[PDB]
Amino acid sequence: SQSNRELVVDFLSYKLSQKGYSWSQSEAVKQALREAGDEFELRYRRAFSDLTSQLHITPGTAYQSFEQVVNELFRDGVNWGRIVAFFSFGGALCVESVDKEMQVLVSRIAAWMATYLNDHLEPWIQENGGWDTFVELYG
Numbered sequence: 157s158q159s160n161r162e163l164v165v166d167f168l169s170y171k172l173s174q175k176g177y178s179w180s181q182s183e184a185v186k187q188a189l190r191e192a193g194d195e196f197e198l199r200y201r202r203a204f205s206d207l208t209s210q211l212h213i214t215p216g217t218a219y220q221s222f223e224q225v226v227n228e229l230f231r232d233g234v235n236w237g238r239i240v241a242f243f244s245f246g247g248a249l250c251v252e253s254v255d256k257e258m259q260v261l262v263s264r265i266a267a268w269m270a271t272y273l274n275d276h277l278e279p280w281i282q283e284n285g286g287w288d289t290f291v292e293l294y295g
């Protein structure tokens with residue numbers, strides 16, 4: 157149970173409840189990410205909703221859709237905004253999965269997110285002041 161895993165789970169659990177799904181499977185960091193994710197989704201509502209709906213999620217295409225969006229997202233480098241988009245995207249992927257009755261994808265998307273965070277985002281996060289800097293700038 158890594159810190160990145162706990163962050164992904166708090167974000168996804170929040171997002172699923174915000175979208176009508178009751179449960180399940182720092183607090184300052186978590187609250188900041190919840191708010192930044194809400195702000196991102198409201199800022200790009202229509203285009204964000206079109207992106208996720210247009211993917212047409214299936215247990216077999218979910219990973220490639222995730223990989224393709226994430227890869228394109230961090231093409232020109234990492235920044236706090238794109239990290240917010242990544243959590244938001246993953247969040248939209250989980251709700252979409254529960255909406256379409258493919259709830260088996262929820263913990264799968266959680267793993268792919270925790271893995272991508274640990275492997276390709278943790279260094280940059282540390283080099284750009286850690287999560288405490290994110291709470292200051294976005295929370």
Ligand SMILES: CCCCc1c(-c2ccc(C(=O)NS(=O)(=O)CC[Si](C)(C)C)cc2C(=O)N2CCc3ccccc3C2)c(CO)nn1-c1ccccc1
Pocket residue numbers: 192193195196199200203204207224225226228229230231236237238240241242244245294
């Ligand atoms: C899940 C959404 C990913 C969005 C994204 C960004 C990006 C990421 C962040 C932002 C952004 O606004 N960052 S910010 O720092 O200004 C956020 C500030 Si808030 C106070 C709202 C957290 C905009 C952009 C961006 O280029 N956008 C805005 C978001 C959006 C949503 C749906 C479709 C297109 C766009 C265009 C990029 C560029 O890397 N590529 N992509 C992308 C990748 C694959 C397919 C389609 C689009």
